[PDB]
Design an enzyme around this catalytic site. Structure first.
Site, PDB file in Angstrom:
ATOM      1  N   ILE A  48     -22.756  10.338 -20.554  1.00 18.25           N
ATOM      2  CA  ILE A  48     -22.499  11.423 -21.489  1.00 18.25           C
ATOM      3  C   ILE A  48     -21.067  11.302 -21.985  1.00 18.25           C
ATOM      4  CG2 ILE A  48     -22.526  13.908 -21.818  1.00 18.25           C
ATOM      5  CD1 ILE A  48     -25.253  12.744 -21.328  1.00 18.25           C
ATOM      6  N   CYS A  49     -20.876  10.570 -23.077  1.00 16.75           N
ATOM      7  CA  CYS A  49     -19.567  10.378 -23.681  1.00 16.75           C
ATOM      8  C   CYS A  49     -19.429  11.306 -24.881  1.00 16.75           C
ATOM      9  CB  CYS A  49     -19.360   8.918 -24.099  1.00 16.75           C
ATOM     10  SG  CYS A  49     -20.500   8.278 -25.365  1.00 16.75           S
ATOM     11  N   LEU A  50     -18.259  11.920 -25.007  1.00 10.06           N
ATOM     12  CA  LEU A  50     -18.017  12.989 -25.971  1.00 10.06           C
ATOM     13  C   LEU A  50     -17.280  12.411 -27.172  1.00 10.06           C
ATOM     14  CD1 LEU A  50     -16.790  16.521 -25.102  1.00 10.06           C
ATOM     15  CD2 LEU A  50     -15.662  15.267 -26.919  1.00 10.06           C
ATOM     16  N   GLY A 103     -23.699  11.241 -26.344  1.00 11.70           N
ATOM     17  CA  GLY A 103     -24.497  10.395 -25.480  1.00 11.70           C
ATOM     18  C   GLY A 103     -23.641   9.304 -24.879  1.00 11.70           C
TER      19      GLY A 103
END
Lengths: 147, 75, 377
Positions: A84-86, B75
């Site tokens: 889960i990269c923002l 994501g």
């Protein structure tokens, strides 16, 4: 700054938890947290329990933490390993973001997938074309893995 | 009526609105108060994301409700 | 014209009476396998007078003509050896944006001053004899070499997110909720230790009046104070050959060009170290893509690389050792989307989604349009 902030965040989480998400250090290492997210009620993941691993960089709060799903989830925007990269750009993380806001954002993502940014092409295609099959598969995976 | 919008930075902005106001008008008010472009606003209420083209009454927003302005994870 | 001015500067620099090569020749033999060891054994003992003679480099057990090519290969190998992060002298600024900088941990060695003086000698020798390295440092490095003041904006070249956070602190107000104080936690071999930016700094919170001093101290500590002794030794070694009055006619970009030459992106390596999802190596939208990349100028190739991977900087070893957000991730091309939609990019996975077009011209048009908003080099 990178440890007093973490202690304050942990105390706040222990003060007024969101009543759904939880987070705590594993053993005795304040820079490595394990978190638990409950499946949103109004979503196929209802009833599941998803574990996340949070690694705070030494530059915290200036650089965002690394949040990775551990439990397998059938989601259009979560790869097999879970990441889960923002990023809308490099213009959304600021020292004012606690770790609770990130967990709330993750729950929001779980309850409202974004199909226009398909990280998993097959799941995104299923979601766009046949929604019922996506719901069925998501709840099947939640039953098999999350529980 | 009155409602409360809590942002990312822990700030709470109180707004005077009516149940018939469009979501677009509320995002416009938040842009006027906080300077956040509407395109970048992600508003959540009771676990559901508010969508343009509808009204507050459609979501059963009543006196002194609390909303969340949340990060847009990719994501 | 930038090129004309740079050429004038180069001619003037090499026409000085203090940068003239002697007519005598120096023989320098090094084994290909042990390049770093032999180079350090030989160069670290040469006198300043000796280093100014013509350089004739030979590889042991490799007899050949065109010594210019041999010397260029030797400098390439040596630059890729000494500046390699694995040797604990330098290090990438961040794992997903590869910018070399002096490693703060390098102080752990019993005597880092000798090694960094050798690095300075190597750089000065490369500049002196019109040979190029192939490394790509961060702009603050060149600004320090030229003795320029370093400001907050310079953190943009090192790390983007850190700069954005500092800028946010500068603009917006700071409350007591942000447990920010004058100290930095640094992890040195597992254990984390606290460094005080100012005396008794760990017990002073940042108000709305101290935040400017806090930003100043953070910038100075991140860019300068952490690597003082090492860089002083390196610059002493460099100025051993090139007097400081000659480096100070360039700027942070002309000096970069002088060291590493005109930067370019290799396409053969790019093609050899890429992988395809739902695409075969013989599919039309892959052969056309590689033809287009072959007949493109370096600026547009860098723009495409930044659009796909995230940054226009490559690792020290090409596309082989390419890192994503979560770890190694080779450049990937995938079939996703409708014909009309433009190619898309997943930055944290180094993925490029090229829909299945029908002709090379359409692919070229879509690919050129999709990268306009992105600036590279």
């Amino acid at each position: 700054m990178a440890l007093k902030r973490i202690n304050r965040e942990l105390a706040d989480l222990g003060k007024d938890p969101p009543s759904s998400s939880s987070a705590g250090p594993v053993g005795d290492d304040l820079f490595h947290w394990q978190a638990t997210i409950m499946g949103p009620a109004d979503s196929p993941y209802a009833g599941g329990v998803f574990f996340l691993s949070i690694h705070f960089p030494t530059d915290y709060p200036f650089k965002p933490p690394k949040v990775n799903f551990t439990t397998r989830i059938y989601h259009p925007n979560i790869n097999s390993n879970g990441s889960i990269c923002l990023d809308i750009l490099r213009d959304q993380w600021s020292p004012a973001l606690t770790i609770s806001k990130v967990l709330l954002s993750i729950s929001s993502l779980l309850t409202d997938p974004n199909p226009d940014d398909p990280l998993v092409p097959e799941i995104a295609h299923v979601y766009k074309t046949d929604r019922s099959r996506y719901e069925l598969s998501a709840r099947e995976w939640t039953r098999k893995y999350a529980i | 009526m009155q409602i409360f919008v809590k942002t990312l930075t822990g700030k709470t902005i109180t707004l005077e609105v009516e149940s018939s106001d469009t979501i677009d008008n509320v995002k416009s008010k938040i842009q006027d108060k906080e300077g956040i472009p509407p395109d970048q606003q992600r508003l959540i209420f009771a676990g559901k994301q508010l969508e343009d083209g509808r009204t507050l009454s459609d979501y059963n927003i009543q006196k002194e409700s609390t909303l969340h302005l949340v990060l847009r994870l990719r994501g | 014209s930038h090129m004309d001015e740079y050429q004038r500067k180069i001619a003037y620099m090499y026409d000085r009476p203090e940068m003239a090569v002697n007519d005598a020749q120096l023989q320098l033999k090094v084994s290909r396998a042990t390049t770093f060891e032999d180079a350090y054994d030989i160069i670290s003992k040469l006198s300043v007078s000796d280093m100014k003679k013509k350089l004739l480099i030979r590889f042991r057990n490799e007899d050949g003509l065109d010594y210019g090519g041999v010397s260029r290969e030797f400098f390439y190998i040596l630059s890729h050896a000494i500046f390699n992060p694995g040797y604990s002298l330098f290090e990438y600024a961040t794992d997903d944006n590869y910018g070399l900088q002096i490693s703060p941990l390098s102080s752990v060695n019993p005597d880092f001053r000798s090694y960094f003086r050798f690095v300075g000698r190597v750089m000065g020798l490369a500049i002196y004899h019109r040979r190029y390295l192939d490394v790509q440092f961060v702009l603050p490095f060149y600004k320090r070499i030229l003795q320029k003041p370093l400001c907050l904006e310079d953190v943009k070249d090192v790390d983007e997110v850190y700069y954005e956070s500092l800028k946010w602190i500068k603009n917006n107000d700071v409350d007591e909720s942000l447990c920010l104080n004058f100290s930095v936690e640094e992890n040195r071999f597992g254990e984390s230790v606290t460094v005080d930016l100012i005396p008794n700094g760990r017990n002073i919170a940042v108000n709305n009046q101290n935040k400017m001093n806090y930003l100043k101290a953070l910038t100075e500590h991140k860019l300068v104070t952490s690597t003082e002794e090492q860089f002083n030794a390196l610059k002493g070694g460099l100025n051993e050959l090139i007097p400081d009055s000659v480096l100070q006619i360039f700027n942070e970009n002309e000096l970069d060009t002088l060291l590493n030459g005109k930067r370019d992106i290799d396409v053969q390596d790019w093609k050899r170290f890429t992988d395809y999802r739902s695409y075969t190596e013989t599919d039309d939208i892959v052969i056309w893509f590689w033809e287009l990349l072959s007949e493109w100028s370096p600026e547009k190739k860098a723009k495409l690389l930044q659009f796909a991977t995230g940054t226009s900087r490559l690792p020290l070893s090409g596309f082989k050792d390419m890192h994503g957000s979560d770890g190694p991730r080779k450049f990937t091309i995938e079939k996703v989307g409708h014909i009309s939609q433009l190619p898309k990019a997943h930055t944290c996975f180094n993925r490029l989604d090229i829909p299945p077009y029908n002709s090379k011209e359409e692919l070229e048009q879509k690919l050129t349009i999709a990268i306009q908003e992105t600036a590279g080099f």
